């Protein structure tokens with residue numbers, strides 16, 4: 001049974017930093033890519049970036065919207081994905097999802113974690 | 120910078136009837152290599168996490184009911200729901216995986 005679980009979301013304020021976590025299981029973690037997708041309340045899904053698998057070298061990719069400010073890390077021994085957010089529009093529900101060049105899609109998703117922004 | 124336009128923004132139907140929705144890409148998502156269309160459809164029920172319905176334009180994911188059918192290639196793609204069920208109330212996103220990943224605006228399906 002595949003599992004993805006996001007956590008580490010809450011209230012913050014622009015310029016600040018927030019660390020998001022995605023504990024996984026039920027599959028060979030290192031065999032798959034891992035993408036982060038967000039969704040502002042009542043808006044569309046937005047792909048933020050992913051980190052490739054074992055054969056690819058765990059290299060990372062980003063969307064122009066978050067590139068630089070955001071960074072994506074993974075723990076190949078514990079099978080946990082990370083989204084290190086740095087620095088009003090970033091507010092949203094944050095989903096981590098299993099990705100890869102097998103089906104070229106995110107075939108498994110977490111339940112997301114809410115990130116708000118209030119002074 | 121790939122742009123996927125989904126049409127229409129929203130639509131409503133009764134349970135049991137047939138619906139189609141469009142996903143047009145500003146760039147071809149077809150790779151001559153493996154001869155695959157790097158487009159996928161995602162179903163998102165209200166207040167729930169997105170689910171993969173179809174990949175490679177026309178390939179149905181495991182567990183997905185046969186009433187969902189993806190079609191098209193290049194820049195024109197279509198999602199067809201044959202005999203809509205109440206469970207189908209959701210927002211349907213098309214997503215290009217040709218270069219990185221990009222989501223369409225999404226099409227919200229209502230069931231009255």
Ligand SMILES: O=C(O)[C@@]1(O)C[C@@H](O)[C@@H](O)[C@@H]([C@H](O)CO)O1
Nearest residue numbers: 052061100101104216217218219
């Ligand atoms: O960036 C990737 O490593 C990746 O392999 C993801 C695949 O889904 C696919 O999009 C691929 C491009 O199509 C280039 O081949 O890039």
Ligand SMILES: [Mg+2]
Nearest residue numbers: 103107180181
């Ligand atoms: Mg699968």
